[PDB]
Design a protein around this ligand. Structure first.
Ligand SMILES: [Cl-]
Ligand SMILES: [Cl-]
Ligand SMILES: [Cl-]
Ligand SMILES: [Cl-]
Ligand SMILES: [Cl-]
Ligand SMILES: [Cl-]
Ligand SMILES: [Cl-]
Ligand SMILES: [Cl-]
Ligand SMILES: [Cl-]
Ligand SMILES: [Cl-]
Lengths: 63, 63, 63, 63, 63, 63, 63, 63, 63, 63
């Protein structure tokens, strides 16, 4: 395959993932993949395989 | 396949994932994929395989 | 296949996923896919496989 | 197949998914797919496979 | 495959992953993938194998 | 004159003046006299004088 | 004059003047007299004089 | 005059004047008299004089 | 005059004037008299004079 | 005059004037009289004179 990404900017301001917690208990931010962040941002992922598992859970409690 | 992404901007302001928690208990932000964020943002993913599982759960409690 | 995405903007302001929780208990934001966010935003996903499962659940409680 | 997306804007202000929870208990926002958000936003998904399952549930409680 | 990423900017200001915690207990930020952040940001990942597992969990408690 | 006040209690819970204001504009609680509050509460006031004025107003707006 | 105040208690819980203001604008609590607060609370006031003025106003706005 | 105040308690818990203000603008608590607060609380005031003025105002705004 | 104040307690917990302000602008607590606070609290005031003024104002703004 | 104040306690915990300010602007606590605070607290004040002025104001702004 082919990918072309041209970009042209004067002023760019980019936040990506921001968290704020005040006086809280048990705050979770969970990302299963990559975090990719830019004035120009490109991400490619390929997974080959008969039993691929991707699992993303915030939290587990037992008992 | 072919992908072309041209972009042309003067001023761009981009937030991606923002969380605020005040005085809370058990706040979860869970993302199963990638987080991709930009003035120009491109994401490609390919999964090949007979039994691919993707699971995203905020939280599990037992007992 | 072919995809062409041209864009032209002067001023762009983009939020993506924003959460606010005050004095709450058990707040969940759960996204099964990617989060892709931009002045220009493009996402492609391909899944090939006879028994693909995608599951997204906020929370599970037992007992 | 072919997709062409041209766009031309002066001022664009885009929110995507926003949640606010105050003094609540058990607030859930659950998205089974991707979240794609932009001044120009494009999403493609292809699923090939004889028994594809897609499930999105807010919450499960037992007992 | 082929990837081309051209970018042209005058002023770019980019944050990546930012966390703030005040007076909290048990705050977690967990990223399963890479964090890639730049005025131009490019990430590629390839995974080959019949039983690939990717798991990302904020926290586990037992008893 | 004579005043006798005997009291005998096991458990006494006494609030006096309580105000709650949420998201309001211009809430006033105005008391012209004393506030006297107790499990046993006694108040005496004597005013001697030919032109005694007592005035209690919540608010005045002009123009 | 004579005042006698006997009191006898096991458990006494007394609040006096309590205010709560959230997200409000211009909340006023105004008491013209004393605030006297106790498990046993006694207040006496004597005013002698031909032109005694007592005035209690929450707020005044002009123009 | 004569005042007698006997009191007898096992457990006494007394608040007097409590204010809480969150995110508000221009919150006022104004007391013209004394604040007297105790498990036993006694207040006496005498004013002698032909033109006594007592004034208690939360706030004044002009122009 | 005569005042007698006897008191007899095992456990006494007394607050007097408490203020809490979070994220507010222009919070005022104003007391014109004394603040007297004790397990046993006694206050006496005498004012003699033809033109006694007592004034208690939270705030004044002009222009 | 005569004042007698007897007191008898095992455990006494007394706060007097407590202020807390977080992230606020222009918080004022203003007391015109004395602050007197004790397990036993007694205050006496006498004012003699034809034109006694007592004034207590939180703040004044002009222009
Ligand atoms: Cl950030
Ligand atoms: Cl963000
Ligand atoms: Cl956002
Ligand atoms: Cl949003
Ligand atoms: Cl950062
Ligand atoms: Cl109260
Ligand atoms: Cl109170
Ligand atoms: Cl208090
Ligand atoms: Cl206090
Ligand atoms: Cl204190």
């Amino acid at each position: 395959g082919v990918l072309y990404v041209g970009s042209k900017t004067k002023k760019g301001v980019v936040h990506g993932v921001a968290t704020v917690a005040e006086k809280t208990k048990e705050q979770v931010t969970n990302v299963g993949g990559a975090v990719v962040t830019g004035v120009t941002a490109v991400a490619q992922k390929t997974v080959e395989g008969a039993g691929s598992i991707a699992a993303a859970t915030g939290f587990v409690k037992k008992d």
